[PDB]
Amino acid sequence: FXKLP
Amino acid sequence: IVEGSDAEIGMSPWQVMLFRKSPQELLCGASLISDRWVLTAAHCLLYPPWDKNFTENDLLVRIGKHSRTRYERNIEKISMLEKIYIHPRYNWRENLDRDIALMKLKKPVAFSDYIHPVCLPDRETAASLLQAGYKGRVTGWGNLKETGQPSVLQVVNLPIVERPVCKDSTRIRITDNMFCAGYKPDEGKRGDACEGDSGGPFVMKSPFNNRWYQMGIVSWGEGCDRDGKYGFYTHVFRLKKWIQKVIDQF
Amino acid sequence: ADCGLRPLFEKKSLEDKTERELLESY
Amino acid sequence: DFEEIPEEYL
Ligand code: NA
Ligand code: NA
């Protein structure tokens, strides 16, 4: 759920 | 949830707890839409990149909870699943577009003061509510900060944000099966879902029939409650016909 | 599908404490 | 840090 790729 | 509050008993009759048998961890959140079906985020089951790939008997579904940790002895219902359905085109490689799955509980559950299904929107319904500025409500037992764990179900009411703003806040490709909500670094309030909240429900209250409708499913966000960053939710109404289709198709 | 009317609020005509926020933005 | 759950469940 913690995007920044 | 971050900068939320504790939920009053029976505030979210449809809130489900996705739980692994072994270890005994809370995987993710979810929601009750029938007496036989739970609706979650696909990425709670299937996420190749983190080697995640759960099966029917790896998970259990705990309905009626309030305490995050405790086995609420006479209140809660623990159900065994019978078949996880991921969207056919869930996009786990690129942006998690179509993050939605259906669960067929081993046997129907019985409703109570504390267990009760949420409605699924209809076009007119999705169409009069899913408007920027309008607040929805997220519920979960996830971290309390990006980076710690709540005692009781948490709750936080957020505004829907116009798609241009959502788009310009991320470098990730935002599709139509997605909506974003949260406060801007300036509106003076805050809150947002966080890890452990995914699969959870984004719900709105109809001003017309005073009913609760699930408009979204907590999907992803870059962090939790960062300024000029919003949470992204699966657009349930746009994935509607698929949903109907599996309940009926099966 | 008797959906979305909570036993302990709507059905008794009892409100939760932050549901009026929701409604006031509509 | 969960409470055991009845084995009826596993
Ligand atoms: Na962008
Ligand atoms: Na923010």
Coordinates of C-alpha atoms and ligand atoms in Angstrom, one line a residue:
Chain A
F1 CA 0.0 0.0 0.0
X2 CA 3.1 2.1 0.6
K3 CA 3.7 3.4 -3.1
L4 CA 6.5 5.5 -4.3
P5 CA 7.9 2.9 -6.6
Chain B
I1 CA -5.7 4.9 10.3
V2 CA -3.8 8.1 11.2
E3 CA -5.4 10.9 13.1
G4 CA -8.6 8.9 13.3
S5 CA -10.7 8.0 16.5
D6 CA -12.1 4.8 17.9
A7 CA -15.2 3.5 16.4
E8 CA -18.3 3.3 18.6
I9 CA -19.6 -0.3 19.2
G10 CA -21.7 -1.3 16.2
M11 CA -20.6 1.8 14.0
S12 CA -19.3 -0.5 11.2
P13 CA -21.4 -3.7 11.3
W14 CA -19.8 -4.7 8.0
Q15 CA -16.1 -4.3 8.9
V16 CA -14.2 -7.6 8.5
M17 CA -10.7 -8.8 9.7
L18 CA -8.6 -10.8 7.4
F19 CA -6.5 -13.2 9.4
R20 CA -3.9 -15.8 8.8
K21 CA -4.1 -19.1 10.6
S22 CA -0.3 -19.3 10.9
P23 CA 1.3 -17.1 12.1
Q24 CA -1.7 -15.5 13.7
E25 CA -1.5 -12.1 12.1
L26 CA -4.1 -9.7 10.8
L27 CA -3.3 -9.8 7.0
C28 CA -5.9 -6.9 6.1
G29 CA -9.4 -5.3 6.5
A30 CA -12.5 -6.1 4.4
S31 CA -16.3 -5.8 4.3
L32 CA -19.5 -7.9 4.4
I33 CA -21.8 -7.3 1.4
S34 CA -24.0 -10.5 1.6
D35 CA -24.4 -13.3 4.2
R36 CA -22.0 -15.3 2.0
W37 CA -19.5 -12.8 0.6
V38 CA -16.6 -10.6 1.7
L39 CA -15.2 -7.9 -0.5
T40 CA -11.5 -7.0 -0.3
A41 CA -8.4 -5.6 -2.1
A42 CA -6.9 -8.2 -4.4
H43 CA -3.4 -7.2 -3.3
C44 CA -4.1 -8.6 0.1
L45 CA -4.1 -12.1 -1.4
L46 CA -1.9 -11.8 -4.4
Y47 CA 1.2 -9.7 -4.7
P48 CA 4.0 -11.5 -6.4
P49 CA 6.5 -8.8 -5.8
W50 CA 6.4 -9.5 -2.0
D51 CA 5.9 -13.2 -2.7
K52 CA 2.3 -12.9 -1.4
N53 CA -0.1 -15.5 -2.6
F54 CA -2.7 -16.7 -0.1
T55 CA -5.2 -19.5 -0.4
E56 CA -8.6 -20.4 0.9
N57 CA -7.3 -22.2 4.0
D58 CA -4.5 -19.9 4.8
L59 CA -7.0 -17.2 5.9
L60 CA -9.9 -17.0 8.2
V61 CA -12.5 -14.2 8.3
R62 CA -13.4 -12.6 11.7
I63 CA -16.7 -10.6 11.6
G64 CA -18.2 -8.5 14.3
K65 CA -14.9 -7.4 15.9
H66 CA -14.1 -4.2 17.8
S67 CA -10.9 -5.1 19.6
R68 CA -8.1 -5.5 17.3
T69 CA -6.3 -8.2 19.3
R70 CA -8.8 -10.0 21.5
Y71 CA -11.0 -12.9 20.7
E72 CA -14.3 -11.2 21.5
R73 CA -15.7 -14.4 22.8
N74 CA -19.5 -14.1 22.4
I75 CA -19.7 -11.2 20.0
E76 CA -17.5 -12.3 17.0
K77 CA -17.9 -14.9 14.3
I78 CA -14.8 -16.6 12.7
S79 CA -15.5 -18.0 9.2
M80 CA -13.8 -20.3 6.8
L81 CA -13.6 -19.3 3.2
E82 CA -14.5 -21.4 0.1
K83 CA -13.2 -19.4 -2.8
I84 CA -11.2 -16.3 -3.5
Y85 CA -12.0 -14.4 -6.7
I86 CA -9.4 -11.8 -7.9
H87 CA -10.3 -9.5 -10.7
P88 CA -9.2 -11.1 -13.9
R89 CA -7.2 -8.0 -14.7
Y90 CA -5.9 -6.9 -11.3
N91 CA -2.7 -5.0 -12.2
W92 CA -0.1 -6.1 -9.7
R93 CA 2.8 -5.3 -11.9
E94 CA 2.1 -1.7 -12.7
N95 CA -0.3 0.4 -10.5
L96 CA -2.6 -2.0 -8.7
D97 CA -5.5 -1.1 -11.0
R98 CA -8.5 -3.3 -10.3
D99 CA -7.4 -4.2 -6.8
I100 CA -10.7 -6.1 -5.9
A101 CA -11.5 -9.7 -4.9
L102 CA -14.5 -11.6 -3.6
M103 CA -14.7 -14.3 -0.9
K104 CA -17.3 -17.0 -0.6
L105 CA -17.6 -17.9 3.1
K106 CA -17.9 -21.6 3.8
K107 CA -21.4 -20.9 5.2
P108 CA -23.6 -17.9 5.5
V109 CA -23.1 -15.8 8.6
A110 CA -25.9 -14.6 10.8
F111 CA -26.5 -10.9 11.3
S112 CA -26.5 -9.3 14.7
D113 CA -26.3 -5.9 16.4
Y114 CA -22.6 -6.0 15.4
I115 CA -22.6 -7.9 12.0
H116 CA -24.5 -6.4 9.1
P117 CA -24.0 -6.0 5.3
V118 CA -23.1 -2.7 3.6
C119 CA -25.0 -1.8 0.4
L120 CA -23.3 -1.7 -3.1
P121 CA -23.9 1.5 -4.9
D122 CA -26.1 1.8 -8.0
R123 CA -25.2 4.1 -10.9
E124 CA -27.4 7.0 -9.7
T125 CA -26.0 6.4 -6.2
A126 CA -22.3 6.4 -7.3
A127 CA -23.3 9.3 -9.4
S128 CA -24.7 11.7 -6.8
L129 CA -22.2 10.9 -4.0
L130 CA -18.8 10.4 -5.7
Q131 CA -18.2 14.2 -5.8
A132 CA -15.1 16.1 -4.6
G133 CA -15.6 17.8 -1.3
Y134 CA -18.0 15.1 0.0
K135 CA -16.7 13.1 2.9
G136 CA -16.6 9.3 3.2
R137 CA -15.5 7.2 6.1
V138 CA -12.7 4.7 6.3
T139 CA -12.3 2.0 9.0
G140 CA -9.5 -0.2 10.1
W141 CA -7.0 -1.6 12.6
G142 CA -3.8 -0.6 10.7
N143 CA -0.8 1.2 11.9
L144 CA -1.5 4.6 13.6
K145 CA 1.5 6.2 11.9
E146 CA 3.2 5.6 8.6
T147 CA 6.0 3.9 10.4
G148 CA 1.8 2.1 16.7
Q149 CA -1.1 -0.3 16.7
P150 CA -4.6 0.6 17.9
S151 CA -6.6 -1.1 20.7
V152 CA -10.0 -0.7 19.1
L153 CA -11.3 -0.2 15.5
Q154 CA -10.3 3.3 14.2
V155 CA -12.4 5.6 12.1
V156 CA -11.6 8.7 10.0
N157 CA -13.9 10.8 7.7
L158 CA -12.2 12.2 4.6
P159 CA -13.1 14.4 1.6
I160 CA -13.1 13.1 -2.0
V161 CA -10.5 15.0 -4.0
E162 CA -10.9 16.0 -7.7
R163 CA -9.0 13.6 -10.0
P164 CA -6.6 16.4 -11.4
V165 CA -5.2 16.9 -7.8
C166 CA -4.9 13.1 -7.2
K167 CA -3.0 12.8 -10.5
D168 CA -0.6 15.6 -9.9
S169 CA 0.3 14.3 -6.5
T170 CA 1.9 11.1 -7.7
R171 CA 4.1 9.9 -10.5
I172 CA 2.1 6.7 -10.6
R173 CA -0.4 6.1 -13.4
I174 CA -3.9 6.7 -12.0
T175 CA -6.7 4.8 -13.8
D176 CA -10.5 5.2 -13.8
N177 CA -11.1 2.3 -11.4
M178 CA -9.4 4.6 -8.9
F179 CA -10.4 7.6 -6.8
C180 CA -8.3 9.5 -4.1
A181 CA -9.4 11.1 -0.9
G182 CA -7.8 13.0 2.0
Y183 CA -7.2 16.6 3.1
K184 CA -4.8 18.9 1.2
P185 CA -1.8 20.1 3.2
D186 CA -3.8 23.3 3.7
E187 CA -7.5 22.3 4.7
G188 CA -6.3 22.2 8.3
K189 CA -7.5 18.7 9.2
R190 CA -5.8 15.4 8.4
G191 CA -6.1 11.6 8.5
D192 CA -5.6 8.8 6.1
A193 CA -5.6 4.9 6.0
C194 CA -2.2 3.2 6.4
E195 CA -0.7 -0.3 6.3
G196 CA -3.2 -2.8 7.7
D197 CA -6.2 -0.8 6.4
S198 CA -6.1 -2.1 2.8
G199 CA -9.0 -4.4 1.8
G200 CA -11.0 -2.1 4.1
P201 CA -14.2 -0.1 3.1
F202 CA -14.7 3.4 2.0
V203 CA -18.4 4.1 2.7
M204 CA -20.8 7.0 2.3
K205 CA -24.2 7.6 3.8
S206 CA -27.1 8.2 1.4
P207 CA -28.9 11.4 2.2
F208 CA -31.9 9.9 0.3
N209 CA -32.6 6.5 1.9
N210 CA -30.3 7.0 4.9
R211 CA -28.4 3.8 3.9
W212 CA -24.6 3.2 3.9
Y213 CA -22.9 2.4 0.6
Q214 CA -19.4 1.2 0.0
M215 CA -17.9 3.5 -2.7
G216 CA -14.3 2.4 -2.4
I217 CA -11.8 -0.1 -1.1
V218 CA -8.6 1.2 0.6
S219 CA -5.9 0.5 -2.1
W220 CA -2.6 2.3 -1.7
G221 CA -1.0 5.8 -1.0
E222 CA 2.7 6.8 -0.8
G223 CA 3.0 6.6 2.9
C224 CA 0.3 7.4 5.4
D225 CA -0.9 11.0 6.0
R226 CA 2.0 12.8 4.2
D227 CA 1.3 16.5 3.1
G228 CA 0.3 16.8 -0.5
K229 CA -0.3 13.0 -0.7
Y230 CA -3.7 11.3 -0.7
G231 CA -5.0 7.8 -0.4
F232 CA -6.2 5.7 -3.4
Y233 CA -9.2 3.5 -3.3
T234 CA -10.7 1.0 -5.7
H235 CA -13.8 2.4 -7.5
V236 CA -16.3 -0.2 -6.5
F237 CA -19.1 1.1 -8.7
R238 CA -16.9 1.0 -11.9
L239 CA -16.1 -2.7 -11.0
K240 CA -19.7 -3.4 -10.3
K241 CA -20.9 -5.6 -13.1
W242 CA -17.8 -7.8 -12.6
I243 CA -18.8 -8.1 -8.9
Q244 CA -22.4 -9.0 -9.9
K245 CA -21.3 -11.4 -12.5
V246 CA -19.3 -13.6 -10.0
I247 CA -22.0 -13.8 -7.4
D248 CA -24.5 -14.8 -10.0
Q249 CA -22.0 -16.6 -12.4
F250 CA -21.5 -18.7 -9.3
Chain C
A1 CA -30.3 -7.3 1.1
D2 CA -31.4 -5.3 4.1
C3 CA -28.0 -3.7 3.7
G4 CA -26.7 -0.5 5.2
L5 CA -29.1 0.2 8.1
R6 CA -27.2 -0.5 11.3
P7 CA -29.1 -2.4 14.1
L8 CA -27.7 -0.1 16.8
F9 CA -28.1 3.3 15.0
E10 CA -30.4 3.8 11.9
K11 CA -32.8 1.0 13.1
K12 CA -33.3 2.7 16.5
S13 CA -32.9 6.1 15.0
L14 CA -29.7 6.7 16.8
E15 CA -26.8 8.5 15.3
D16 CA -23.1 8.0 15.6
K17 CA -21.1 11.1 16.7
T18 CA -19.3 11.9 13.4
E19 CA -22.0 11.0 10.9
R20 CA -23.2 14.5 10.7
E21 CA -19.9 15.7 9.2
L22 CA -20.5 13.3 6.3
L23 CA -24.0 14.6 5.7
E24 CA -23.0 18.2 6.0
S25 CA -20.6 18.1 3.0
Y26 CA -23.3 16.8 0.7
Chain D
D1 CA 0.2 -10.3 20.2
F2 CA -3.2 -12.0 19.6
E3 CA -5.2 -14.2 21.9
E4 CA -5.5 -17.8 20.9
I5 CA -8.3 -18.7 19.1
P6 CA -10.4 -21.8 19.5
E7 CA -9.0 -24.5 17.6
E8 CA -12.5 -25.0 16.2
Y9 CA -11.2 -22.3 13.9
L10 CA -8.2 -24.1 12.4
Ligands
NA1 NA 1.2 12.8 -12.0
NA2 NA -2.3 14.4 2.8

